[PDB]
Design a protein around this ligand. Structure first.
Ligand SMILES: CCCCCCCCCCCCC/C=C/[C@H](O)[C@H](N)CO
Ligand SMILES: CCCCCCCCCCCCC/C=C/[C@H](O)[C@H](N)CO
Ligand SMILES: *[C@@H]1O[C@H](CO)[C@@H](O)[C@H](O)[C@H]1NC(C)=O
Ligand SMILES: *[C@@H]1O[C@H](CO)[C@@H](O)[C@H](O)[C@H]1NC(C)=O
Ligand SMILES: *[C@@H]1O[C@H](CO)[C@@H](O)[C@H](O)[C@H]1NC(C)=O
Lengths: 44, 246, 48, 272, 293, 246, 272, 44
């Protein structure tokens, strides 16, 4: 099982590299400045 | 201590009584261009007190049969003040924006507004013709409305073929007349190029669409204006030359 | 020029260029000249 | 994270002050109320994978991109067959790619060529990529087909389909499918703004193809372009189009005859 | 001659095919309820729309076009290559390959490039033939060898211009030819039978145009006139025909006057005069004349 | 290594072959306003690349019966480029200036020019009337000539009642056609107030007066132009408002 | 250096003595005035690559070199088809290679053979390289086709195109495309100096090809030679030719009918 | 990624070797004996 081997001098001619599991969801779900707590009223 | 806020940029201030939390678009603050991402060689100018301030546009009367209004933001401040003058003389431009939309009413009015920003908000022509010479295309006053603004014809499709329902992925805020009377969005510079001309390219555009219609009983006030204030945060200009209008 | 043909063999160029003028008049003839570069935008300037 | 999310054991609460189900939507944020702050849940160790939902596993599909006809007649012949490289010709990959504003990727173009009636006769073809700025070949016996300082592929019809890898070659830092501006300065008209939305950062040259022979070959070929995206990065997610497409470089829709995003029901107080 | 406009807007022909050699038949203009151009929508002409299948131009296109039958392969309309549809002053379209051009002369590029701006650019430098391609080009020259690359079809060179959107400015790698005498302001005419256009004929005529067209024939008996195209929406600007022997006026036609299509006059020194105004301008004239010896 | 000099300000450069030493007016360099001497509260803007560059005015043909020309320097760049646009939008202004006057000729021409600056160069009316209603006063095109310039009527008295002979106390430089072909003066901000309007107040003004007349033999060139280049060093602007022309 | 050049932050100068913009051109040297000794620049970290502009990446293109016809008739037959190995037959690679005086490289000759009408029938060909001094084959059934002590390639038409590698075999230390002299001694005439410029250090033998069969094969083949330069070193750069070529071994041009290096303009005081 | 491997005894039959980034431009731009300084007059 080895698909990280390239056959040319150029790097864009390879296959899919190591997968990245990064998942930042808070930049779309809570784009607010005051961090709203989980157990609180959002407005006071 | 959360419903009150005073935003101060330059020599202007915005006080509030009924406010939600401020919205920071994509979690990124608007800053200056770093040397790693920049590509121009000439040194850019930064007034930081003369163009970074709250500019107030006109007010639009929110009626009952209203569809909605929209704006091209690097093109609305293209002629108003030191910012517009400084943008006409320069070829390059890069800044963020701070927004504030005012809409107040009594505790006996009902309604809701959806104010949001759309990067690269492209206006689509309306028609069913596929021939190249008769295919409808929007005019210049429709693509770039200027400081006045433009109205929607089919606000259900955002005048672009994309449904209004799915437009909640954008940096948005609601104006519910029973909860608040203002909405605030801070958007950074969003583009695939470091600098760009602020005359023939609008980065994003505000849109205000009343989802719930304005309703009231006979006896209350009938003139409900829609006021918008914009602060061009962290402005940069490059390529000084003759001043061009459009 | 040679730089023009070399840039003609390729399709995209970058970096700064240099234009060098040279006066080949008499020794007693004097004068001042203004060589002005203008960034893109409108057409050729009309006056100085 | 290789799994989705585990669930914490919960219980009931009888106390004042804590309201996790009253998340305000006027602030523009998404409700962060979990199940543990609600109806009593249990302890579940979830091991469902999230690898397939990534962007590199979502854009790793070829799809049809272009269809190029080559008649090569005897009396009404042209010889060559150019094809402007654009992705907006077929609405499947266009709908899959126009859900973002800025993208950056590589390509794995593949060319499947068949005959009119369908037959693999051993005819050698020449696939030429003309970059933007290079002269286009005019004729099956032109000067441009020498392919000096120009990449080209020689393959037959009986051979397997050709497949090359294409790097990121836009002069900007990323591609864009929506350009809210104009390509050049000047006064813009009010009648027909046919240059609005045009982005010069997407014209990836022209693709040409001919038949390598001397006299002629009375055969009508039909090439298909399959482009596999790889090493893709996307920015600023955009909603998916709900209207039928009408043009290639313009997102025009029908003013009348509008298509609703959801089909109609019998009544609102009815689930079926 | 059948077309006196740069886009064939007035072509009342009997062509019911798209091409004479290698063409498909056109559909009738009354069996086209699917498309927004039919006789159920436009009665009493409107570009020419009856119970025929002729190649007309009702939408203000760059060339006349008909409806072809859709063969589930896209195209439902094709341009008609009419051999007898060329304004006098249009030589045709030709191919353009590379560094040796068909027109060896000055070149000019602009984002507002119509037919008359390029004709005026080549005329203000005393060139004989103009030329444009791909919408943004103006190739001048005086060489007689402009067919060095071959003759192209008329439907191939229908790329729209950038300044105007009703004129064909050549095409990608295909140059369209024009002589510089069209749309000029006066000229010594000594041909047997030629056409005289208004100033800025492909465009609308400018404000304050005044010139003198002179026609001399070395020994002609009498000259014959004609008025194929005449469109004036005003009564201040007007055309005149004068004789320069004793300097008297023969006939004065204006917007409120319908000129006769043909008459003879026993003169040989006719001079044309055109006094324009600065209020209203719609279109010019295409006066064709003929001298019999 | 003293007769050659290359001045670089922004994206402009001035090379020289026949030059004297550069003149620094009153031995003080033009700098920014310190916090001790300043009086405004709002933060001033500093482009430093878009207004700080060499602007070249028109050329004037030096004839044999020439008297001289003069200029109001905060009023010449009042409409040319990013500097003029930035000065129309602002109320306050403070900068120094770098000058360069080009006048070349052959080794067979003779003549001398006196180029100098005069702070608060007030134009005086010419007449012998003492009645208030008929006392002659200079027009606006005479007081502020604009980018074109104005000529002298009595250059022996500098058009102000002060003799030209005693005008050597000012920061001056000579252009002797046998020695050099250019003159360079660097003048700082000279005023009794920290900031000031660059529209209705000119701080100083250049004057060029041929003391020795231009002489040559029949056969040489006859067109001798006078070219001037100005660099607004260390510019500051304050009080952003609507743009006014004059 | 893997990048081009970085820019130092600059500022303004107000002082006498330093003149960086007065570089004299009479000395024969190039002006070394940078941007930092001029208009105020900024700090830019340039990471644009310079790898593509090298000589080995500039001469690594095949291009067309030779076209050899082989009729192989029945009554007017010859059988063989020789081709003198020279690069001056096609002006593209000639223009790309005559911008230097002395070069030294290797070759990657490739042979693409097609029929008259265009068809790959399984006919085996024999490509022979005849070094300078060896006898040339005279006939399709000659004695020289034995290829003893002589390299040759056997390949069919249905096979992929053949490709061999060729070393540097000039008796001098490098090639030359411009020889300012005469090949031998003696009195040289004034009428027609047809031997002037001839360099014996470039005659790389002759290339021959036949059809391996017994009787005949009524087919007109047409071979194409594609030579890829590799391991190339160039000396003494020469300007690029601006005149059209007229002969192969002579840089003759038209005395009358001269081609200007730049096209004409409307006026000198006009940029467009 | 390996293209430095040859398959024959001869060395000229290989592919493009390691690239050389050498760039001497001063032998064409300033072929002079007296080194002209950057901030000076070229002739005195
Ligand atoms: C040897 C033949 C190769 C054929 C493929 C051509 C190579 C160049 C392909 C560039 C890849 C561009 C992918 C899409 C680019 C732009 O976004 C589209 N033109 C606009 O939709
Ligand atoms: C087995 C068949 C091989 C076919 C190729 C022949 C091998 C010898 C090729 C020598 C390479 C020479 C390249 C050019 C040499 C001289 O410069 C030219 N003859 C003059 O332009
Ligand atoms: C075209 O019109 C002519 C009229 O003479 C008629 O004979 C012919 O059949 C028509 N062809 C088609 C295809 O309608
Ligand atoms: C259209 O007109 C033609 C000619 O008069 C006639 O034959 C045909 O039936 C008409 N079609 C319709 C739908 O009326
Ligand atoms: C004028 O005379 C010609 C004779 O050459 C005749 O053909 C023409 O019809 C005449 N015109 C009129 C209006 O009668």
């Amino acid at each position: 099982n080895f698909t990280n081997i390239n056959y040319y001098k150029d790097s864009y001619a390879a296959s899919a590299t190591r997968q990245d599991f990064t998942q930042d969801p808070k930049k779309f779900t809570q784009p607010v400045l005051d961090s709203i707590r989980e157990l609180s009223a959002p407005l006071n | 201590s959360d419903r009150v806020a005073q935003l101060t940029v330059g020599n202007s201030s915005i006080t509030t009584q009924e406010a939600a939390n401020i919205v920071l678009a994509y979690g990124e603050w608007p800053e200056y261009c770093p040397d790693t991402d920049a590509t121009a060689v000439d040194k850019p100018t930064r007034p930081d007190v003369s163009v970074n301030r709250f500019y107030t546009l006109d007010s639009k009367m929110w009626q009952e049969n209203s569809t909605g209004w929209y704006w091209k933001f690097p093109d609305v401040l293209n002629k108003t003040g030191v910012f517009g003058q400084n943008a006409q003389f320069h070829y390059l431009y890069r800044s963020g924006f701070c927004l504030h939309v005012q809409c107040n009413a009594s505790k006996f009015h009902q309604g809701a507004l959806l104010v949001a920003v759309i990067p690269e908000f492209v206006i689509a022509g309306r028609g069913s013709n596929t021939k190249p010479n008769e295919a409808p295309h929007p005019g210049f006053t429709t693509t770039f409305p200027g400081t006045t603004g433009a109205t929607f014809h089919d606000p259900y499709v955002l005048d672009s073929g994309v449904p209004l329902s799915q437009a909640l992925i954008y940096p948005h805020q609601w104006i519910n007349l029973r909860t608040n009377n203002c909405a605030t969005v801070i958007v950074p510079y969003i583009n695939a190029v470091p600098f760009d001309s602020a005359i023939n390219h609008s980065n994003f555009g505000l849109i205000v669409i009343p989802v719930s219609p304005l309703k009231y009983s006979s006896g209350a006030t009938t003139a409900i204006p829609i006021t918008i204030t914009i602060a061009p945060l962290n402005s940069e200009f490059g390529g000084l030359r003759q001043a061009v209008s459009q | 020029t040679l730089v023009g043909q070399i840039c003609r063999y390729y399709t995209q160029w970058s970096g700064s260029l240099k234009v060098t003028f040279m006066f080949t008049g008499s020794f007693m003839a004097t004068g001042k000249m203004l060589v002005a570069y203008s960034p893109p935008g409108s057409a050729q300037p009309a006056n100085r | 994270a290789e799994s989705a999310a585990n669930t914490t054991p919960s219980s009931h609460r009888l106390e004042t002050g804590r309201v996790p189900a009253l998340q305000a939507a006027e602030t523009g944020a998404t409700s962060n109320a979990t199940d543990e702050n609600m109806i009593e849940t249990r302890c579940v160790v979830n091991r469902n994978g999230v690898l397939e939902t990534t962007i590199n596993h979502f854009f790793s599909r070829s799809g049809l991109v272009g269809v190029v006809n080559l008649t090569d007649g005897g009396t009404d012949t042209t010889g060559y067959a150019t094809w402007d490289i654009d992705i907006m010709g077929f609405v499947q990959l266009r709908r899959k790619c126009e859900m973002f504003t800025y993208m950056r990727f590589n390509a794995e173009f593949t060319f499947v060529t068949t005959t009119k009636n369908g037959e693999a006769r051993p005819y050698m073809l020449q696939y030429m990529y003309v970059p933007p700025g290079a002269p286009k070949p005019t004729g099956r016996d032109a000067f441009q087909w020498q392919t000096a300082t120009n990449p080209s592929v020689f393959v037959k019809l009986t051979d397997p389909p050709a497949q090359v890898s294409v790097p990121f070659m836009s002069p900007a830092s990323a591609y864009q499918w929506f350009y809210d501006g104009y390509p050049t300065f000047g006064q813009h008209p009010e009648t027909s703004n046919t240059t609005y939305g045009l982005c010069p950062n997407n014209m990836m040259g022209t693709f040409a193809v001919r038949v390598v022979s001397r006299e002629a070959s009375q055969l009508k070929l039909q090439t298909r372009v399959y482009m596999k995206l790889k090493h893709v990065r996307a920015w600023v997610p955009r909603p998916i189009r709900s209207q039928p497409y009408l043009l290639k470089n313009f997102p025009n829709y029908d003013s009348s005859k509008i298509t609703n995003s959801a089909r109609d029901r019998s009544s609102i107080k009815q689930a079926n | 001659p059948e077309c006196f406009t740069a886009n064939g807007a007035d072509y009342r022909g009997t062509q019911n095919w798209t091409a004479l050699q290698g063409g498909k038949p056109c559909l009738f203009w009354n069996e086209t309820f699917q498309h927004p151009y039919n006789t159920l929508k436009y009665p009493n002409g409107e570009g020419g729309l009856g119970e025929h299948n002729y190649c007309r131009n009702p939408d203000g296109d760059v060339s006349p076009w008909c409806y072809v039958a859709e063969h589930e392969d896209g195209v439902y309309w094709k341009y008609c290559e009419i051999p007898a549809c060329q304004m006098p002053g249009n030589l045709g379209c030709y191919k353009d390959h590379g560094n040796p051009p068909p027109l060896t002369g000055t070149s000019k590029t602009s984002n507002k490039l119509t037919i008359q701006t390029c004709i005026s650019f080549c005329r203000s430098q005393r060139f004989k033939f103009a030329g444009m391609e791909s919408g943004y080009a103006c190739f001048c020259g005086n060489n007689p060898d402009y067919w060095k690359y071959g003759e192209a079809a008329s439907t191939e060179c229908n790329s729209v211009c950038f300044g105007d959107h009703t004129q064909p400015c050549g095409g990608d790698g295909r140059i369209i030819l024009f002589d510089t005498l069209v749309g000029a302001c006066g000229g010594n005419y000594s041909a047997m039978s030629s056409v005289v256009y208004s100033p800025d004929f492909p465009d609308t005529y400018a404000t304050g145009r005044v010139c003198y067209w002179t026609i001399r024939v070395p020994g002609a008996s009498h000259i014959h006139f004609s008025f194929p195209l005449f469109d004036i929406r005003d009564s201040a600007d007007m055309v005149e025909l004068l004789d320069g022997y004793t300097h008297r006026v023969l006939a004065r036609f204006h917007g409120r006057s319908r000129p006769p299509l043909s008459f003879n006059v026993s003169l040989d020194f006719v001079i044309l005069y055109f006094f324009s105004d600065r209020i209203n301008q719609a279109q010019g004239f295409a006066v064709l004349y003929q001298a019999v010896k």
